[PDB]
Model the fold of this input.
Amino acid sequence: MKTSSFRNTYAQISLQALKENAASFKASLQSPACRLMAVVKGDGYGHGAVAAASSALNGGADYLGVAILDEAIELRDAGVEAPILVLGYTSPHALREAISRNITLTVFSTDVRDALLEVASEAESPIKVHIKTETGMGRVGVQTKEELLDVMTPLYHHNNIEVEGIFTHFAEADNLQSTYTDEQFARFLSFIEAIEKDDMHVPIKHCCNSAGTLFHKDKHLDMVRVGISLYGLRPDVSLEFPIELTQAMRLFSSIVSLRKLPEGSSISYGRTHKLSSEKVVATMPIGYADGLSRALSNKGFVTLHGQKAPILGRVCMDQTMIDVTDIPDAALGDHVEFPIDEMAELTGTINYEIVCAVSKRVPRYYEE
Amino acid sequence: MKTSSFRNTYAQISLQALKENAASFKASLQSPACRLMAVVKGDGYGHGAVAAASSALNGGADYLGVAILDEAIELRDAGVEAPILVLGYTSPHALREAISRNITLTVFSTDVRDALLEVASEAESPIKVHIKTETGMGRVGVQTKEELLDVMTPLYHHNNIEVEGIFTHFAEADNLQSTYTDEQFARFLSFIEAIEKDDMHVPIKHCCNSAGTLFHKDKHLDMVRVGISLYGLRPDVSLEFPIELTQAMRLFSSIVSLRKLPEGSSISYGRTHKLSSEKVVATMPIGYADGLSRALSNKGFVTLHGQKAPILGRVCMDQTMIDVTDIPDAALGDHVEFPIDEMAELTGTINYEIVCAVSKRVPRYYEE
Ligand SMILES: *Cc1c(COP(=O)(O)O)cnc(C)c1O
Ligand SMILES: *Cc1c(COP(=O)(O)O)cnc(C)c1O
Done:
């Protein structure tokens, strides 16, 4: 993780916010036996995987979730010893590496099942797996009771494999007017009924993401998987948080040039903006190679001195211009802030993408 | 740079293409005295700064360009010894570090001018600077003859500073129906006339980017600054290359799940796509945390087996679904390719952003 720079363009990350958000979530769970999994995929949703994991554990998280084995190995190499579940696919050729670093694996297909049966016969402590079930996200997971039984049963009865978990994922738990989450939950319980009729007991049943955790407490089961709201960001901006949470990331740049340009002057590539009068134009050392979306061209804004300054013309790779004509105290060197949810709204996306897109060129400053 | 992974999602980078592209550009220049600057900002436009710089030098580049001092320091730390120009702003507090690593600096403001005058008062050998002039990009640079003279003259006459260069940048050199590039060029020459009337001779006058280099050979002057087309990508997809170039980056993922889903099934978050009939849906281990634009949701495609497979529903952080129903030989494990220019077109952006957005989670495989 880049954590220093000679350029005043940076993401400030509050570790205390992350810790307190984990504690707030832990306190909110249906039962004290329910585990809090902190989901730190995508390099901690752009905040930094190791920083987010460490903070979340300090706040009471019980498990970590990542998307791919690479991310789990990164955590282990940084000295994180907490349980880690790879939520997505892990291929047969990667299984020995995963088991050697004590990484819990998601399984939903026979190629991985069969490789695991051969590999498990050659390992020290039991291998831990969670089985993924399909209930309506239309993404990954076994699809029928028959397939679940076919995939899980040989793993369950292998003397060196523990089927620790079984889970599903919700497509719209943030839509509080929809029956779909209850329908998915019913299908999930239907899968579970099938394995329990075959006397297979799985100790961690789980289905909730941030939205499920916040708004579907009846579905907390044995573990919840909190991602976006661990970072104090809403699953959907139409929602209001029912627990106390703080946004952990704030994105800043600064003014490195401040100039008056005459009426008729065009700004940036393609001359897509022409000044309607004399304007004071500030240039910032940030652009789309820092992850500032080019779709904010001629439509986004930054804040400074309690006012909004609109972006003029096209966002460049490394530089972006703003109009500070109505902000008389704007000066060379001023730091400015980028609103994360508003950038998502203006470009037709979600805060998840905005924070992940902050590129490796932008240092993260952990201010605690 | 990440260069290995347990997941089959990757950017293949042809070093031979980069080297040959640099050679092709070098051969095309107006005169053999004209220098080729390889622009490798944004981590070599997402290809890898060190790899791109090394390849370009091997192909005949004379100078390297980066956006910010961080990038120049990275190249020096990797053992690159070629001249490097920081094209954007460098702040007063960073000047000593830059000069100690023999980095050429762009200057266009008095804060940096005055700090330089005090610092140069130090240093082993002369400090090299280029002066940025504003001619119509509306971004950075001195704006008037008076300002140019005020900024440059004390630097020119300091016994330990060399004003090696003076430059400008074009807003629409890729627009071959516009007079603006010729107008900018005339303003640039007007700046140059002003300093030469004051008997200040600058050895490297430069103004061309990729588009200027390709289509405005009369403006090559002492050096051209080739970025996007060094990577074999067009400045604008409406253009055809007038010289021989090869696209250096190719982006791939793979099928990690292949399932038949019934009519009426919804795919991914928000149920934004529902199957109009029974479909074979493949899931790929790639999503917007890898830099795959979420704006490709329900509209982008990948290629496999000589056909296009459309993206179904929303791109997730780490996974994306495609329809392979009309591709009978699609199988678990198939690798698929993402078309870079078409992804830009479909999401209303440019190839520059697409290749820079490929995130640090995606390994670069250097093919040669
Ligand atoms: C991303 C993800 C989560 C976390 O979702 P949020 O909305 O970020 O809370 C949980 N589980 C799985 C399987 C995921 O992919
Ligand atoms: C980005 C940039 C270049 C290269 O532009 P391309 O279109 O990528 O060729 C050249 N000069 C300056 C100052 C730049 O910012």
User: Anything to note?
Assistant: DSSP finds eleven helices and 19 strands in chain A. Chain A has two domains: 1-14+248-368, 15-230. Residues A 39, 87, 169, 209-210, 225-228, 235; B 317 surround pyridoxal-5'-phosphate (ligand 1) (CB under 6 Å). Chain A touches chain B through 73 residues (CB under 8 Å).
